[PDB]
Amino acid sequence: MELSFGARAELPRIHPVASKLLRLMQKKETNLCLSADVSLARELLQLADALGPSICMLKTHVDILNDFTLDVMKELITLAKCHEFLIFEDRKFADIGNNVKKQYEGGIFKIASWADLVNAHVVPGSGVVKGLQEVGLPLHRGCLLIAEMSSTGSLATGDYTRAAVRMAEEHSEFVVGFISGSRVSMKPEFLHLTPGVQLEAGGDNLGQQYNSPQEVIGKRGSDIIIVGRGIISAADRLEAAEMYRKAAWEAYLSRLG
Amino acid sequence: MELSFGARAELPRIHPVASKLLRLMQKKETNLCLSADVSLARELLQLADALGPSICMLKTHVDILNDFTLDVMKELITLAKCHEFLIFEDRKFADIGNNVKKQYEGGIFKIASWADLVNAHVVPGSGVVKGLQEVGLPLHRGCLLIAEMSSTGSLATGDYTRAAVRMAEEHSEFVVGFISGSRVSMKPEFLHLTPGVQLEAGGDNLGQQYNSPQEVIGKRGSDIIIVGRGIISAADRLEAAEMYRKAAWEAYLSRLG
Ligand SMILES: O=c1ccn([C@@H]2O[C@H](COP(=O)(O)O)[C@@H](O)[C@H]2O)c(=O)[nH]1
Ligand SMILES: O=c1ccn([C@@H]2O[C@H](COP(=O)(O)O)[C@@H](O)[C@H]2O)c(=O)[nH]1
Ligand code: PRO
Ligand code: PRO
């Protein structure tokens, strides 16, 4: 029933992006995604280089990157290839299909040209996925659907979460998993990534709520933890990243028996 | 019960941004918002100048504007002041509060520095509004909550729509209305803006669905129509904008008796 990341990478129905990710997770013993919520390219690239060995994925946030250029992205790709992690852009695609197609491909950011993974809200209906899919690109790309949110008052519950799971099933040629607080699909080909993670209980003053790596990976059945401030605002960032990596990895191992 | 836009502009509980908008709608006899879904600054500014007299609002889409700069925004502000329309940015704010605060103020776009209006999805809970509010700015700014969507399979229905209305009520110092398909609040201080509008029946091939100005303003009780392709893809854009303006304006008048 429960399979290692390396075995999941070989599943018949696995998407190539998911397989690549699962293989590097197994190789590096990491199921940590760094949320690089920073405003300067210098710091983004410093984090990518210093923490690259500890992470399976780096979540970029280009809408707050004051000095974004595509040359910054090219240097991030070099680090991602060297250290072996995927690039996941934070942008909350959440529009009619015709608009998300334009937003994914175009503008200054040209997200599709560099992001291995993107995430979408399911509120618009399945056109949100179909519009992203319609971007022509001869590269391997995946999408994550936001099935649950970590924040107080989230409406991504109940039938909304179920709709996200059905939408993912039905678009598995492109959708490779979920942003969720827990396992929401029983199909092992899908990835579950969980934000709202810190070692200590608490939250922020703007509705964020935290749970621990052991809780979300071990008890709630998710695959990957997404951690921003727990690392990037820590006194010792590498020490923090390693604590999060070890916590999430052991919690995952505990489900393999 | 039903009040003109000019009378609504004087309501005791009206927000200053809503009042400014309602006054110019009455003065210019327009309840049309142009959706300027274009990739070049030249075209954005050509549309703003040519169609400015016909519109109450221009919805920018900076995430697809290949040559965005803040100098383009400054020139748009000049046109908005000259022709008398508000600037509404399309970005679908849809994140935890701590992130939307950063996204509204920062990055290359500095949206809060120029957008009179923004819109947010309610799925994260009320932190999505509280985070936008927390941006310090000594200017008049408002937010619209996405209570319904026009696209096939939209999940913004039922209890989700009701949650959006409650969130708006409860944050009326900043939330000035809704993106919706119909009137969703009975409070006349709130603005209802409806996308998914074309003169003819139909849709697109990515889940957009259209209703007419008469249907959405006259029968469904909305205030403003948001029109993109019906104008910007028309053979004669000014002719189209005037047809949409006249349609929406008459439909509104029909409810005043
Ligand atoms: O439900 C969600 C979806 C996404 N994120 C993202 O994960 C990161 C959490 O950062 P932090 O609270 O660990 O600093 C942020 O970038 C935020 O967008 C959440 O926190 N919750
Ligand atoms: O429920 C919604 C919310 C927003 N819009 C926006 O309104 C415009 C509709 O354009 P068009 O279909 O009139 O070209 C697009 O920019 C889209 O983001 C919708 O169509 N539906
Ligand atoms: O579906 C695909 O594979 C391509 C890649 C980006 C979106 N379209
Ligand atoms: O609430 C307000 O009025 C200011 C303006 C932008 C967000 N904060």
A27/chain B closest Cα distance in angstroms: 32
Question: Do B85 and B52 touch, CB atoms closer than 8 A?
Answer: yes
A97/chain B closest Cα distance in angstroms: 5
Residue count of chain A: 257
- Tokens standing for residue A30: 């990491």
- Tokens standing for residue A196: 């709202």
CA dihedral B73, B111, B59, B29 (to 10 degrees): -80
* CATH at B68: 3.20.20.70
Q: Is the CB of B250 inside a 6 Å radius of any atom of ligand 2?
A: no
The residues, any chain, with a CB within 8 Å of residue B151's CB and separated by 6 or more, are A96, A97, A124, A125, A127, A128, B196, B207, B208, B209
The rounded distance, in Å, linking the Cα atoms of B221 and B181 is 9
SS3 content of chain B, % helix, strand, coil (to 5): 40, 20, 40
Say how many domains are in chain B.
1
Could you tell which of B34, B35, B204 is best to mutate to test the pocket of ligand 2, judged by most ligand atoms within 8 Å of the CB? B35
- Tokens standing for residue B41: 């600054």
The rounded distance, in Å, linking the Cα atoms of A214 and A181 is 12
Helix (H) or strand (E) holding B235: none
The rounded distance, in Å, linking the Cα atoms of B196 and B213 is 10
The rounded distance, in Å, linking the Cα atoms of A202 and A204 is 7
How big is the CA angle at A45 (ends A43 and A51), to the nearest 5 degrees? 95
For A206, the closest of B64, B131, B153 (CB atoms) is: B131
* Best residue of B62, B96, B154, B205 to probe chain A, by most A CBs closer than 10 Å: B96
For A155, the closest of B95, B122, B153 (CB atoms) is: B122
Q: Name which residue sits closest to atom 1 of ligand 4, judged by CA.
A: B133
Question: Do B231 and B241 touch, CB atoms closer than 8 A?
Answer: yes
Cα separations (Å) of B17 from A75, B77, B189?
43, 15, 11
Residue A43 pairs with which residues in a beta bridge? none
The rounded distance, in Å, linking the Cα atoms of A33 and A38 is 15
Whether B130 is a known active-site residue: answer no
Are B207 and A124 a contacting pair at CB < 8 A? yes
Resolution as reported, in Å: 0.9
- Tell me which ligand sits closest to the C-alpha of residue B141: 4
Method of determination? X-ray
Helix segments in chain A, DSSP class H: 5-8, 16-28, 41-51, 70-83, 97-105, 127-133, 159-170, 213, 229-232, 237-253
Domain that holds residue A65: 5-253
Q: Which of B24, B25, B13 is nearest to B188 (CA)?
A: B13
Question: Do A196 and A208 touch, CB atoms closer than 8 A?
Answer: yes
